[PDB]
Amino acid sequence: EVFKGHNLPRLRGAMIGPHVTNADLLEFGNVWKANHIRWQLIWNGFPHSPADSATLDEYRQWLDGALKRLEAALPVCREAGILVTVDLHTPPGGRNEASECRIFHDREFQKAFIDIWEDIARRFADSDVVWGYDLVNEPVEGMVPDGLMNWQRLAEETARRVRAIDQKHAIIIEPAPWGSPSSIALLDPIDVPGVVYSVHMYVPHAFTHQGVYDNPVGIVYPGTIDGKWYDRNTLRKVLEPVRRFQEENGVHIYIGEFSAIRWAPADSACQYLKDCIEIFEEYGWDWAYHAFREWDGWSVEHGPDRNDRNRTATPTDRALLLRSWYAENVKPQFS
């Protein structure tokens, strides 16, 4: 009775990078047994991008090329037995210095967001490979000027417009700010059919992003982190608002991203991923691991040493964990 927008027991897969090859996709679906990818429409980087200073014309040209490749990859995903999340990872206008989206600050970019989503929905309305439309990656509002919509309202309006065009696909809404688990309590369920809610799981940052940016390394999990005990029970507490939202509203949950950096000490990253997945599975949440063949920091084909960028000779524990879960997947059946 709860809307998922697919007829499988569960979607389990990964984020891919924008330069993913057809061979990569076929391997991931047919050999790794993933039944799902999140396709990031990303302009170089996140949270900072050339989009941040690009004109709307420049942005639309970039996005046109990104969509062209997505469109060409869908037949490959069909052959690989993969359903696709279309993620607008870099929205029109990009973000200011504080990583706040211009779609909340500028009338032109706010209007463009809606217009662009109408075009994407029109393009993919009939696709049986597309599962859902993740309207914007990790929205961050900052101050919203009088006369512009905040995320609650913009998500509602954009979802209405997409649903007018597309009678089949899930509309995937992440809470603001940051698509964080804690942010889901700030979102009211939107009054549009066929909506799925999504968060990203990287809590605690000090652990999952150790040795990224200027975060120190050597942070063990389980263990004391940010002065607090972290284990599977702590992760359950982090995700409790999401579980509450799911149960109280009778809605489906999708984890669009989760990870731990590969060079976390010992088996820390593997245990974090295991604990995350176990919780997601208990609650019946679909999920995408971040990421398959993207930045090697998040790669399960790369090893424990931050200074070694080479693939490992033999499977990592993280790769074996993911494949043990993908082995439970049912493949989509296409006409």
TrEMBL record:
UniProt KW Iron keyword: no
EC number: 3.2.1.4
Sample GO molecular function, one term: beta-glucosidase activity
GO cellular component, one term: cell surface
Assigned keywords, A-Z: Carbohydrate metabolism, Cellulose degradation, Glycosidase, Hydrolase, Polysaccharide degradation, Signal
Positions of the Glycoside hydrolase family domain: 7-290
GO aspect biological process, one term: cellulose catabolic process
Sequence similarity: Belongs to the glycosyl hydrolase 5 (cellulase A) family.
Full protein name: Endoglucanase
Species this protein is from: Thermogutta terrifontis
Lineage: Bacteria, Pseudomonadati, Planctomycetota, Planctomycetia, Pirellulales
Coverage span on the entire protein: 192 to 526 of 531
